[PDB]
């Protein structure tokens, strides 16, 4: 991390060659897709083979998550969305009162904000 923007600006102006850094979601997508699961799983298994309970429990939990990912046959890229769906209309009924005002669940308002 780089808390102060001045330091990051100086780094990019002076040494903007090797490291690429952006603040916001796509960065995570690129990092995870470039990242690999099997190697980390093997490293965590090797760590578990040793002792040191303190870090061993964290290794166990992380290995559990990574092994779940590996066994699922899927990829982590599903955690960054690019096209959200919308439920059918009747599931978000439009009610027209005597004055025509909408009064049912605000799902419509939330979709309005997002769009």
């Amino acid at each position: 991390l780089i808390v102060d923007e001045n330091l990051y600006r100086e780094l990019v102006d002076r040494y903007g060659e090797y490291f690429t850094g952006a603040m916001g979601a796509e960065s995570i997508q690129k990092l995870i897709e470039n990242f690999d699961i099997d190697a980390e799983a093997e490293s965590l298994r090797d760590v578990i083979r040793n002792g040191k309970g303190q870090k061993k429990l964290r290794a166990l939990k992380r290995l559990k998550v990574v092994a779940a990912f590996q066994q699922s046959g899927n990829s982590p890229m599903g955690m960054v969305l690019d096209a959200v769906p919308v439920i059918p209309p009747e599931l978000r009924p439009m009610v027209q009162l005597d004055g025509g005002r909408f009064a049912t669940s605000d799902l419509n308002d939330l979709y309005r904000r997002v769009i």
């Binding site: 429990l57 166990l60 939990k61 290995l63 559990k64 092994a67």
Partner: protein, 58 residues
């Protein structure tokens, strides 16, 4: 009595585990007796050390 036995049989059918050792599951996590025994016999049959667990109710 059997109406009560059928309940207490389900109630006390968990095996808390103190150490995982050669097992993936987190120590101190409830595992039913059957699956814990199956994994223990599998790991022992291949030479892996057994997991130390004890029965407990809830």
């Amino acid at each position: 009595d059997k109406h009560i036995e059928v309940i207490v049989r389900q109630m006390l059918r968990r095996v808390t585990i103190i150490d995982s050792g050669s097992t993936e599951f987190l120590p101190g996590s409830l595992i039913d007796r059957a699956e814990f025994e199956a994994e223990n016999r599998r790991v022992v049959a291949e030479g892996g050390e057994p997991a130390a667990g004890r029965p407990v109710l809830m």
